[PDB]
């Protein structure tokens, strides 16, 4: 009841999606996510949730 994503896999995902959609407008939207995903501060927030979530399901 959570499911993570890991910006690392999510980052490579957008890269695929970008070269997978190549609909121009799609690359722009994709790039948007890519920007946030690559954002230092943003990445920090997501990184916290990722690891902490893992501990949530892991450590009872």
């Amino acid at each position: 009841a959570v499911k993570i994503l890991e910006i690392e896999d999510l980052f490579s995902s957008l890269k695929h999606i970008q070269h997978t959609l190549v609909d121009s407008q799609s690359q722009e939207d994709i790039s948007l996510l890519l920007q946030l995903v690559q954002n230092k501060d943003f990445q920090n927030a997501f990184k916290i949730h990722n690891a902490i979530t893992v501990h949530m399901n892991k450590a009872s």
């Binding site: 994503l5 995902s13 999606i17 959609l21 948007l32 946030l36 995903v37 927030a45």
Partner: protein, 62 residues
């Protein structure tokens, strides 16, 4: 406002993923759903809000 970006992002996640499922890529879709849900998460939003404050610090500090 910043919320405009995140809002567009969520809609962007659903849109992009839609094209994938339409193109035949139901692999990255899980990422768009995972990224979309997490983005919507309450506590998660709080984490971003915090970082947002830090952004103001760098923009205000001079």
């Amino acid at each position: 406002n910043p919320a405009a970006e995140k809002m567009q992002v969520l809609q962007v996640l659903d849109r992009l993923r839609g094209k994938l499922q339409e193109k035949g890529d139901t692999t990255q879709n899980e990422k768009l759903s995972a990224f979309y849900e997490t983005l919507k998460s309450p506590l998660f939003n709080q984490i971003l809000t915090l970082q947002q404050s830090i952004k103001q610090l760098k923009g205000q500090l001079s």
